[PDB]
Every structure is written in structure tokens, then in C-alpha cells.
Design a protein around this ligand. Structure first.
Ligand SMILES: OC[C@H]1O[C@H](OC[C@H]2O[C@@H](O)[C@H](O)[C@@H](O)[C@@H]2O)[C@H](O)[C@@H](O)[C@@H]1O
Ligand code: CA
Ligand code: CA
Ligand code: CA
Ligand code: CA
Length: 922
């Protein structure tokens, strides 16, 4: 065998485009048409030509071959690479212990290329099955405890035990299982509560070095402050459970599709909820336990929302996030002295705000004073707040540190197991006292960091290049998610995800999960996870969002269309965009030009828009389709009088309706990301639309969601006309811009120009529309909350609003005021319960009519003449505070609706089922 040598820098190892996908297959474009193709390896050293310019390291001979069908299906995106075969006698385990490098040279031996090797594929093929059959983490049983961590490429792994004061009390070399590649150590039950970390000795391809470092348990179920050490815990311990925990039941059913359809979500954040509530005990503000302060404005508010129809609370990241320091002395919040901020934040101390350091004001008081002179030319509020955000307690938390441990900063005591009971106490309070189910936001699509050096890199330190998705040529961790893209298509990560969800389900009694960027997950993986969880809780609900994956080349993604008929819900952006207007990418003038159905598209144009009546009627089509569950097979009459199925209604080049059942669709017009509903209406509302009209626009926008068949979802505060002062992405904009005032003084609008880094290009349009009308005050907030509760109350007032089954929707739901002769902005939906619909689902009525007049004109409906239509008792009871205030039902049967109004009419059921409102044949 000729000796590979350099030509007798540009000939040294470069890139990492070689892929060791299975025991005997290596896919690499470098050895193509090359005479000498080898796979060099070194246990403890780095391959490199010796001084003699020769690569005198051990290797295996690679022979050209064709990619098998097994590898082709597993990695479609690699099926194109030149395939190479390894001898069937090579010691895979031995080579995986160190560095492997693919080298190609000419017949004469001179090197032509050398590259690092990606081994995730061979890792699964070799150890996955065996490793999948085992359980991980610090498992505390009756006989004692068993620690287990998967580290198939590590040369050494030691279990390091620490005392409460964090002194090493023992370092145990673990036992490696040859079949699985997992390491374990069994001890006595006295290790309960002990802190620990795994001391790793493993080769990391990014640094090309056998690293030595201690890492927390990715299966950690308890942690020390700021997640520095994992901790042994038995979640079953009654000491970690609030009184009566085991008997906690779901206040709302989620068994049948009809049950699921009634879901009405309120997306909340732990600090957003209580950070500003002075009626919440000071020590609980921004904490899980704030939910237990029954006499506070916040809790009382949520209680009333629940009583009125809100069924679920969805929590932004409450798993262990990385972007908030849990050591209180390293943190400074706006309610504290500016002097504290200067001592914990050196950036502030060296800024133009340094002069406030020895002042006697709180940061909050300083921010308040900076408001008067704040403008697009002097955005001083955000300037100061941007420095504040670096060391405060605020962050949405979409930055996974540990997937199966509650976040520590939201606990009154972040050290050890304490947070576990506090978290459960909150869950119990929400379900038992507030009467709402709980949904958790999960972020398995990425990790906070990767590599062998970052503090928050956990998974990529233990099994390098396995848990992260890498670029096919460079080996670099991709960041399409934002951060460190994970690899759910890899078996052991899929298992980690499922095992994690099992704990949140069983041990924390979470009722549902919302997957962040779910389309970055293989459809097969999401479904497998659901199958495993349904075994634990048959009624658990899974849903997610995203819509910009780009991973189709690697596997079938969990997208809106691919999930059709699976029962997995997905946020629908169809009705969202049609009602809000425009899209998430809009900036500058487009923000004002792109009005939506909820802001007067076509019927009440602002001075910049160019929207045509046809474009406005198209949005109405998307809106009606959404109110009917955004079904692919739902039949309606479009803006041109044409008979169309939901899938035929275009949505920016994609088929609008995609679902099989309304329970697979989550409608919404506001969410944590992107501008709040109120800020969008402020950007879009015509100058002449007065304050009272804008409040009704907010209610009308929300009416399309609440009175629709899809699952209803809304952002915490929409009922309060919540504003973020135009901030589009407020994930790190602190308490200041994310403020929700449960004392009802204002909606946090106009409290300074938003962050310049992200909204700077919008300062011009903001200054132009910001002061159009007055800032909502207590009168407006109370009026909106009333409108909001009226809507949620109407949604649960009849099972006809939440049919659940797609076929049933098609059999009962229809629309009026459609076609080319339609009155723009008037949405009229009928729901049948008459003889022709089948069984009577509502003993009180034979049918319901939902009329939403999103227009500055009064509209008269003649469709139901002689039908004896009556206004809903719920709206009648609201009198002139109703969204239906002013509605009139004449003697003949015609109905007149005032501008910007919403009316729910009904056909009182007689002695027997009546004619109802049969769906018209099309
Ligand atoms: O902290 C990281 C990241 O958090 C926030 O984004 C989270 C996800 O938000 C979705 O709306 C978006 O589609 C995804 O791509 C994001 O991962 C925050 O908005 C962002 O600025 C931060 O980088
Ligand atoms: Ca944390
Ligand atoms: Ca912050
Ligand atoms: Ca890609
Ligand atoms: Ca009936």
C-alpha cells in the first residue's frame, strides 16, 4: 500500500464533508474517481502529516460502492454523495473513540483531499436500538439509585458527586455498556438530593481534541442555582407535591373532537403576568406562586376570564431556560435602585447613563422621566432599556438549557428541589382554583449552544456532533431556528424528547404541549412522541407552529399540510393575516398600507393603502374559511361567486384550507411574537377611526377567532388592548415594553419608541400614526374586557360553535353575503341544528347566525325573513355594553347591524326540532 504524502496547507484536513452513515458506508464527494480512498484514525492524537510529509497513522481501505436503499431512505439528502464501503471486519467502536479523517490520494500516493467525518449516522446504526431500550438520568428507586448517560464516543466518563456546598465528595468511574454505548453507576438511596455532574473525556470534532470537562445531566430532573449542577431527585416524593396533588384532575375535557374544539387558550408569561401587579405579594411578583395570590388583580382577572369561557392557560417557556441568571445578586430589575443596576451591569456604568448610578432613583423612575423627550430622533427609553435587558430577570425563554427541569428564576428559591413543588403548586392553582387546563410551550427544535466550551452546551459536549443538525459540508451547527439547531431525526434525541414529555405529562400533569418550530421535526417523530404520551395520558393534545422549515430534503416535515388528518394541531396563519392584515415580514409603510378585515380593509381605507375591493374580499374569503375551521374540503362561494373548496382558496401561493378537522387548526389574531393586535390596528386604522371604533375593531378581530370552529387562541392582554409600544419582537425587551397593567390604568401604549436594532426602520411610520387618537385608559380597558368575555361566553354557550368534526362542520356550517354582490366587511355565518343537519345538539335552538359587521356602515340582513330570529340572551343582557348594542330585529325578520358590531342570533327551538338553517347545495 502506497504511503500518502504531501506533494513532493491547502493539502491538510479541511471541512467535514465525509459522512459515516452506517457500519460499512461512508459517503464522501472527495474520494470520487480517486485511486486511494482511506479512513484514517487516531485515538488520542490529531491526524496530520509528520515532518516527513507523510500521514503515518492507522487506516482502513475504502472501496467504491453504491449507496444501499437503507442509507438512501435514512438520509435522502445524501443519497447523491459517492458511496464507499468499509471492510466488514473494521472495529467501529475503536475508531469512534477518537478522530477519523477521510483521505484521498492519487495512484502515486500524493494527497488530493482530507476531511473530518460526521458520525451521527453510524452512531445510530451501531448503538441506537440497544441504547433506546434503556432509561437515563439519576434514577432513584427503592433499592437505591442508578445513573445512566449515553456517551457512545467517550473514552472515559466519571460520576462526580458534590456536597451542598459544592465540594467534590466522590468521583466514580462509570461502567460502559458495549452494546448501547451508555455508561452507568449504581449506588445507595443515600445519594438522594446529591448534586452531580459527569466528567467527560471525549473527542470533539469541532476542536479536534479529546476534551476533558464536567457536564450536567441532559436528563436532569433537578438542578442547583443557575443549572451549574444536576441533582438526584425522586419526583414521586410527596414532599415535592402540594396537598392533594395526586388527585388533581383536568377541569376541561379533551377526549373527543367536540371537547377539543371548545379549547380557548390564553398565552401567558410568568413575569408578564405579575411583574407589575402591586396587589401580588412583592416576593411573588414574577414567580410561579403569583398564581396563588387569589386576592390580587391579576388572579382575580384570570378567574373572571375563566368563568367567562377561557379554558386553557398556555405558558411561555417554563422549562430551564439559559438567558436569565438565577443568582439574584447578579440581577437588577427596573423596580430596584439604579445603583444596583450599575453594580451588576458594567455596560450601564460606562454608558451615557452612568450619571444615574449615584442618583437615588430606581431604573423605573429613570425610564419614566426619559419618556417626555423620547422620539424617533432620541430613542432614549429603549437605549437605556437595552442595557437593562442584559442583566434583568426578563426573557421569553426560548433558549433550552435543560428540557426537563422547571426554570429556576421563577421560583422563590432556585437552589435544588424547591422549585419543583412551587411549580406544581402553580399548576394545581390554575386547574383547581382558576379552573383552566395548562399547556406548555416546548422548544426541542434547538439548544441554547453547542461546542466544547459554551457554559450552556450540554448535549453537544457529551455526544459531540450527534444532537445537533450540521451543514453537510462544513460540519457547522446550523442556526435556521435562530440558535443551535437540534437533530430530532436522530433516534436518541427523539427518545430524549419523548422521555422529557413523559415527565411533564406524568409528574407535572401538563394537559397539552405546543411545539416551537414544529416543522423542524420529522412528522414521524412528532407522531411517535404522541403515541408514547397517549399511553400515559390518552387525552393529551399536541400542536405546533413554524411554516418556514426547509428541511423537506432530509425527511418528511411536521407541517400544516403533512399533518392533515393526524390530529396534531397547527397554528393557522390564514385567518391571522386576513384579519390582522399584511404579514410578519412587513416594515415601514407596508405596516400601515396592509390593512386587514379587522382594521377596515377596503371599507375604511387609511391614506396610504392601495388595497382594492377585490383584495379585501379575498381576505374575507380566507376569514370565512378560517371561521369554518380552515378545512381543505369545506365548500364556500368565493369573492367572484365561484364555488370553491377550502384548498382552492389561495394563501400567498399555497392552498388556504389544509385541515381535515377544525381541531387540527388553531386560529388567532395575536400572539407573543410579532406586534400585538392593538399595535397593528394603530398602524393600520384610518385617521378618522376614533378611539371607540378602534376598541370595536379589536373586538371584531377577536370575534372571528372566538366565534369560529377552529381552536381559539389569544395573547395574554388582548382583552386589555395590550400594547408593546409597537415592539415587534419583545423577547428581551424587559418588564417595560411587555407590561400588562391589571390595575387597568392603560394598555402600555406610547411608553417610548421600541428597540432600534429591530424596529428602527419603523420609527418613521410609528411617529406618523402613534398619536392619531388617545391612549386607552380605564374606560376603554373595561369596555374591551366586557366585549372579550361576551365573545368567550358566546363561544361556550352552545356546542354548535365547536362541532369538532370536519364532516359535521361541512354538514352544518354555511355563509351568507358572499359573491360579487356582497357587502364588503360583513361576515355572516350560519350553523344548522335543524332536521336536515341530523341530531339536535342544542335543545334550546334550531340554528345560530353569527354576524360580524366589520365596516363603518349599518348593514341590513334580509336573508332570514320570517325565520323568527332572536338576539342571544347573553348579548341582550349586556345592554348597551354589548358588541350587539344597537342591533335591531324588525317585525318582518330583517336584521340591522350598526357599524363595527357583532351579533349572535338564534332560532328558538319549539316542541320539536325545526327547519333550522340548512346548508345550501353548491
Ligand atoms: O432566544 C432566541 C430567540 O427567541 C425568540 O424567537 C423564538 C422563536 O420565535 C418564533 O416566532 C420564530 O419563528 C422562531 O424562528 C424563533 O426561534 C426571539 O423572537 C428571537 O429574537 C430570539 O433570537
Ligand atoms: Ca434557568
Ligand atoms: Ca433580559
Ligand atoms: Ca439543509
Ligand atoms: Ca336543537
Amino acid at each position: 500500500d502506497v504511503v500518502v504524502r504531501l506533494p513532493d496547507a491547502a493539502f491538510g484536513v479541511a471541512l467535514a464533508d465525509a459522512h459515516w452513515v452506517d457500519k460499512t458506508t461512508l459517503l464522501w464527494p472527495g474520494g470520487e474517481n480517486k485511486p486511494i480512498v482511506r479512513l484514517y484514525y487516531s485515538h488520542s492524537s490529531k491526524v496530520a502529516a509528520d515532518s516527513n510529509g507523510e500521514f503515518s497513522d492507522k487506516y482502513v481501505k475504502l472501496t467504491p460502492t453504491t449507496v444501499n436503499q437503507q442509507v438512501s431512505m435514512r438520509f435522502p439528502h445524501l443519497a447523491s454523495y459517492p458511496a464507499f464501503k468499509l471492510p466488514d471486519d473494521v472495529n467501529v467502536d475503536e475508531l469512534l473513540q477518537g478522530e477519523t479523517v477521510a483521505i484521498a490520494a492519487e495512484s502515486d500516493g500524493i494527497l488530493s483531499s482530507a476531511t473530518q467525518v460526521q458520525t451521527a449516522g453510524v452512531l445510530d446504526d451501531t448503538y441506537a436500538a440497544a441504547a433506546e431500550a434503556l432509561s437515563y438520568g439519576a434514577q432513584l428507586t427503592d433499592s437505591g439509585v442508578t445513573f445512566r448517560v449515553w456517551a457512545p464516543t467517550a473514552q472515559q466518563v466519571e460520576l462526580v458527586i458534590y456536597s451542598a456546598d459544592k465540594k467534590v465528595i466522590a468521583s466514580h468511574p462509570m461502567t460502559r455498556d458495549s452494546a448501547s454505548g451508555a455508561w452507568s453507576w449504581q449506588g445507595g438511596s443515600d445519594l438522594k438530593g446529591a448534586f452531580y455532574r459527569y466528567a467527560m473525556t471525549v473527542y470533539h470534532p469541532q476542536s479536534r481534541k479529546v476534551e476533558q470537562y464536567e457536564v450536567t445531566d441532559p436528563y436532569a430532573h433537578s438542578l442547583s442555582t443557575n443549572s451549574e449542577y444536576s441533582q438526584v431527585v425522586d419526583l414521586n416524593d410527596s414532599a415535592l407535591k402540594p396537598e392533594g396533588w395526586d388527585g388533581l384532575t383536568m377541569p376541561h375535557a379533551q377526549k373527543t373532537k367536540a371537547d377539543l374544539a371548545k379549547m380557548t387558550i390564553h398565552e401567558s408569561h410568568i413575569r408578564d403576568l405579575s411583574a407589575w401587579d402591586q396587589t401580588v405579594p412583592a416576593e411573588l411578583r414574577g414567580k410561579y406562586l403569583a398564581l396563588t395570590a387569589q386576592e390580587s388583580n391579576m388572579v382575580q382577572h384570570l378567574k373572571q376570564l375563566s368563568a367567562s369561557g377561557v379554558t386553557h392557560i398556555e405558558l411561555l417557556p417554563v422549562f430551564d431556560l439559559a438567558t436569565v441568571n438565577e443568582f439574584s445578586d447578579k440581577v437588577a430589575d427596573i423596580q430596584q435602585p439604579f445603583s444596583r443596576l450599575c453594580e451588576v451591569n458594567s455596560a450601564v456604568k460606562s454608558s451615557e447613563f452612568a450619571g444615574y448610578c449615584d442618583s437615588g432613583s430606581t431604573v423605573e423612575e429613570v425610564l419614566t422621566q426619559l419618556k417626555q423627550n423620547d422620539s424617533k430622533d432620541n430613542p432614549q427609553v429603549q437605549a437605556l432599556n437595552t442595557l437593562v435587558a442584559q442583566t434583568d430577570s426578563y426573557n421569553w425563554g426560548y433558549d433550552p438549557f435543560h428540557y426537563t427541569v422547571p426554570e429556576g428564576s421563577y421560583a422563590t428559591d432556585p437552589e435544588g428541589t424547591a422549585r419543583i413543588k412551587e411549580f406544581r403548586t402553580m399548576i394545581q392553582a390554575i386547574k383547581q382554583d382558576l379552573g383552566m387546563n395548562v399547556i406548555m410551550d416546548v422548544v426541542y427544535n434547538h439548544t441554547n449552544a453547542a461546542g466544547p466550551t459554551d457554559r450552556t452546551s450540554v448535549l453537544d459536549k457529551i455526544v459531540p456532533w450527534y444532537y445537533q443538525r450540521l451543514n453537510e459540508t462544513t460540519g457547522s451547527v446550523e442556526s435556521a431556528t435562530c440558535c443551535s439547531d437540534s437533530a430530532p431525526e436522530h433516534r436518541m434525541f427523539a427518545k430524549l424528547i419523548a422521555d422529557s414529555l413523559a415527565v411533564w405529562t406524568t409528574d407535572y400533569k401538563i394537559d397539552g404541549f405546543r411545539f416551537d418550530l414544529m416543522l423542524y421535526h420529522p412528522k414521524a417523530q412528532i407522531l411517535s412522541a404522541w403515541e408514547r404520551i397517549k399511553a400515559l395520558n390518552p387525552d393529551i393534545y399536541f400542536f405546533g407552529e413554524g411554516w418556514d422549515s426547509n428541511q423537506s430534503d432530509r425527511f418528511e416535515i411536521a407541517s400544516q399540510i403533512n399533518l392533515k388528518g393526524t390530529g396534531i394541531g397547527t397554528f393557522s396563519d390564514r385567518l391571522r393575516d386576513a384579519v390582522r392584515g399584511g404579514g410578519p415580514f412587513d416594515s415601514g409603510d407596508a405596516l400601515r398600507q396592509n390593512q386587514g378585515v379587522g382594521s377596515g380593509a377596503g371599507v375604511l381605507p387609511n391614506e396610504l393603502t392601495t388595497l382594492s375591493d377585490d383584495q379585501a374580499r379575498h381576505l374575507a374569503d380566507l376569514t370565512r374559511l378560517g371561521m369554518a375551521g380552515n378545512l381543505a374540503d369545506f365548500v364556500l362561494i368565493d369573492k367572484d361567486g365561484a364555488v370553491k373548496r377550502g384548498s382552492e382558496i389561495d394563501y400567498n401561493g399555497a392552498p388556504g384550507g389544509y385541515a381535515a378537522d377544525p381541531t387540527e387548526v388553531v386560529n388567532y389574531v395575536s400572539k407573543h411574537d410579532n406586534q400585538t393586535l392593538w399595535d397593528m390596528i394603530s398602524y393600520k386604522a384610518a385617521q378618522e377611526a376614533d378611539l371607540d371604533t378602534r376598541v370595536r375593531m379589536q373586538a371584531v378581530s377577536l370575534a372571528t377567532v372566538m366565534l369560529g370552529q377552529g381552536i381559539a387562541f389569544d395573547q395574554q392582554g388582548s382583552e386589555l388592548l395590550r400594547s408593546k409600544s409597537f415592539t415587534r419582537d419583545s423577547y428581551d425587551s424587559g418588564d417595560w415594553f411587555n407590561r400588562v397593567d391589571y390595575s387597568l390604568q392603560d394598555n402600555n401604549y406610547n411608553v417610548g419608541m421600541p428597540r432600534s436594532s429591530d424596529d428602527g426602520s419603523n420609527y418613521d411610520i410609528i411617529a406618523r400614526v402613534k398619536d392619531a387618537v388617545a391612549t386607552p385608559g380605564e374606560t376603554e380597558l373595561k369596555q374591551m374586557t366586557a366585549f372579550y368575555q361576551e365573545l368567550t361566553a358566546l363561544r361556550k354557550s352552545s356546542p354548535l360553535f365547536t362541532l369538532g368534526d370536519g364532516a359535521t362542520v361541512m354538514k352544518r356550517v354555511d355563509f351568507r353575503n358572499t359573491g360579487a354582490d356582497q357587502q364588503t366587511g360583513l361576515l355572516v355565518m350560519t350553523i344548522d341544528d335543524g332536521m336536515q343537519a341530523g341530531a339536535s345538539l342544542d335543545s334550546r335552538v334550531d340554528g345560530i347566525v353569527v354576524a360580524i359587521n366589520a365596516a363603518p356602515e349599518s348593514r341590513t340582513l334580509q336573508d332570514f325573513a320570517g325565520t323568527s330570529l332572536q338576539l342571544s340572551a347573553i348579548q341582550q343582557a349586556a345592554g348597551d355594553r354589548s358588541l350587539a348594542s344597537g342591533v335591531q330585529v324588525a317585525a318582518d325578520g330583517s336584521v340591522t347591524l350598526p357599524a363595527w358590531s357583532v351579533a349572535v342570533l338564534e332560532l328558538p327551538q319549539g316542541e320539536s326540532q325545526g327547519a333550522g338553517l340548512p346548508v345550501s347545495s353548491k
